[PDB]
Design a protein around this ligand. Structure first.
Ligand SMILES: [Zn+2]
Lengths: 79, 454, 78, 156
């Protein structure tokens, strides 16, 4: 099996581009970690629409709760 | 695409699984919302990297550590080991050390004080109890002003032993209370020396006495959890004297041969201890033919060749009795050729600091070492397998912890590593089998973490 | 009686176990059936004429155990 | 190692010379090549069996010389018993019958007495089976000795 883990920020397009590392074969499943920021919320749906029109691997857009912005050391340790 | 290469990970970190550190997830539509209950995984990872750094740092030099598990110690803690032992500041560290006891007499445990009365109050026949004789301890005990010699030392234990232990109730109390003293001292393996024929009666054969002693310790061992259990093995003391009755030696030697195959598990008889009257008339070779049956049945022999300031007695003990361990033997350096033989053959030397100080006397708290010092560090430097013991917990009025700390005052500059090396020596010198040695080594790997290092 | 069997240049460990068993049992039972002595039996030859077993049997003599000896298949008075 | 050979006939004058030579050479050289022990070489039988030389080897033990006993063409455990205890041998040569005495095997392992095995010589002199499937009643006792805790060395 081949699983791709991809963190995402304000640049949702990195995940679909990360899909093309292996070529046409792709990944058996991809999982995306996301923070609870509202700025990056619109990118979550853009990932969802891409996943719908490119199905076949398992998808997860798991969002880290109570992590909005990187403010101090406690935020990074929580992430 | 820029690829940074595969990562092998760390050997003990790539085995971690999700169930061990679960991630609570709440499903909002098609997107998971994850949270961490606590910070346990990072505490596990950082504790691993903290330990991994220690092993790699101490990797070069692991052969000099008597206990290989010490390589996981912080480098400051390992430098603490090489520092000289402090008798007053390291009392807590020594107390928590898993210790090995190789030279301990059953009849010299509850000789005076409150422990003597606790054994007496559990006599099965109180009317047969001997009157408590007046045996005043020398002033400054357990550290007398002057050495008292061997004759006065054995008289300090006249309220216990053969006088008291002929009572089945007193014998049971003596065994159980001695085990409680071993547990309180964090002793992991002990070898208790007993004279079952000395406690025999008309209706109680020496085999009955020995079987009671073994089962008293076995019952005490079974009632103790495996984690802190002190394994007790038994040595039978063959006591020599000037004529009188040497059929008691034949009874003890035969009892140890009989008991050797009888118990293959738990508390068991693992050797004989040739002791008693030390003189050129009762030197080792006089009994060489008595111990041929002991050697045929694979019984180990330890010899009390340590008072008369002779070296010829130690020669027969090594070569005429095939002794695996030597009791006391504080004058090996008198024959540098015998000292080389003892180290080469792996014959262990049983040192009893308080008993040696009380009987013989040694310079104390001297900042330099010469010509009179306790020979512990000289023996270690010569490759002798040296063990530290209590001899008599009652007469000497000191535990194994106190005996270890006294070596700081007896030997100037003895390090805390050297104390650990004696425990390793005692484990190697034990008359234990594969199962007992394996269990003992797992206990010795749990060295207490020092406090207030640097 | 416990039999200490002489075996040609062989294990004296079984003899040691038997002789020690008798010494332990001689004083264990003071009534009824009891162990009262040892028997020296087994192989017999000029090697095992039983003079060199005298060291093995001194402990038996110390505890007052009686001894009986097999004069085996042989025509030797020694 | 200086070899003291037992001989049929009781000739012990060359043994006396070899034992005296090793004592003299033991303290003569303290660096480099040095004489470190004596080997009691091979003539079997109850005559010339270990303990007969216990008196001869008292001087060797008194000068700190180690002793190895060289058993050969024999099937008796009494020689090994006497080598360990009457001779205080620190090593044993060709001790291929330790398992036949369970007490002796435990004593050898407990005391750390090494056993010098010579695979080709033992095969050429005694004839152990080769390339057999698992084990049993004929196998070279090397792996049996190792499982018993015996210090085993392989030699030429
Ligand atoms: Zn003692």
């Amino acid at each position: 099996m081949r699983i791709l883990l991809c963190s995402v920020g304000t640049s949702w397009a990195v995940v679909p581009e990360a899909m093309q590392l292996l070529g046409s074969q792709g990944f058996d499943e991809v999982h995306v970690l996301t923070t609870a920021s509202s700025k990056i919320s619109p990118g979550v749906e853009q990932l969802l629409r891409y996943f719908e029109m490119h199905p076949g691997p398992r998808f997860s857009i798991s969002r880290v709760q109570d992590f909005e912005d990187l403010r101090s050391e406690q935020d990074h340790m929580l992430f | 695409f820029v690829r940074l290469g595969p990562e092998p990970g760390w050997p003990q970190l790539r085995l971690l699984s999700a169930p061990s550190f679960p991630l609570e997830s709440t499903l909002q539509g098609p997107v998971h919302w994850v949270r961490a209950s606590d910070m346990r995984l990072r505490q596990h990872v950082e504790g691993v990297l903290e330990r991994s750094r220690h092993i790699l740092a101490a990797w070069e030099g692991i052969s000099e550590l008597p206990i290989p598990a010490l390589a996981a110690w912080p480098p400051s803690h390992l430098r603490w080991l090489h520092e000289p032992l402090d008798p007053v500041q390291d009392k807590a560290w020594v107390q928590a050390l898993p210790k090995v006891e190789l030279h301990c007499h059953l009849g010299g445990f509850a000789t005076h004080g409150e422990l003597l009365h606790k054994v007496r109050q559990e006599a099965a026949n109180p009317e047969s109890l001997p009157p408590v004789r007046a045996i005043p301890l020398p002033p400054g005990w357990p550290i007398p002003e002057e050495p008292i010699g061997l004759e006065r030392y054995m008289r300090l234990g006249d309220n216990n032993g053969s006088a008291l232990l002929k009572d089945p109730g007193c014998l049971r109390a003596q065994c159980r209370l001695l085990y409680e003293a071993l547990l309180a001292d964090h002793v992991a393996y002990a070898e208790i020396r007993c004279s079952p024929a000395n406690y025999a009666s008309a209706s109680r054969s020496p085999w009955v006495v020995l079987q009671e002693i073994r089962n008293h310790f076995q019952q005490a061992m079974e009632e103790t959890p495996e984690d802190r259990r002190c394994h007790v093995n038994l040595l039978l003391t063959a006591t020599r004297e000037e004529g009188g009755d040497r059929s008691r030696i034949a009874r003890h030697l035969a009892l140890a041969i009989t008991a050797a195959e009888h118990w293959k598990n738990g508390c068991r008889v693992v050797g004989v201890d040739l002791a008693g009257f030390e003189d050129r008339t009762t030197r080792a070779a006089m009994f060489a033919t008595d111990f041929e049956p002991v050697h045929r049945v694979g019984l180990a022999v330890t010899v009390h060749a340590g008072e008369n300031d002779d070296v010829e007695g130690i020669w027969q003990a090594v070569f005429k009795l095939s002794a695996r361990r030597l009791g006391h033997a504080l004058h090996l350096s008198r024959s540098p050729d015998l000292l080389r033989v003892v180290a080469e053959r792996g014959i262990a030397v049983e040192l009893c600091p308080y008993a040696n100080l009380q009987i013989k006397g040694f310079p104390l708290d001297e900042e330099q070492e010469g010509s009179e010092t306790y020979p512990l560090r000289g023996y270690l430097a010569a490759g002798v397998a040296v063990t530290l013991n209590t001899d008599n917990l009652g007469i000497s009025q000191a535990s194994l912890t106190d005996n270890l700390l006294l070596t700081a005052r007896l030997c100037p500059g003895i390090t805390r590593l050297e104390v650990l090396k004696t425990q390793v020596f005692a484990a190697q010198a034990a008359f234990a089998n594969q199962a007992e040695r394996k269990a003992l080594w797992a206990r010795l790997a749990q060295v207490p973490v020092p406090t207030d290092t640097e």
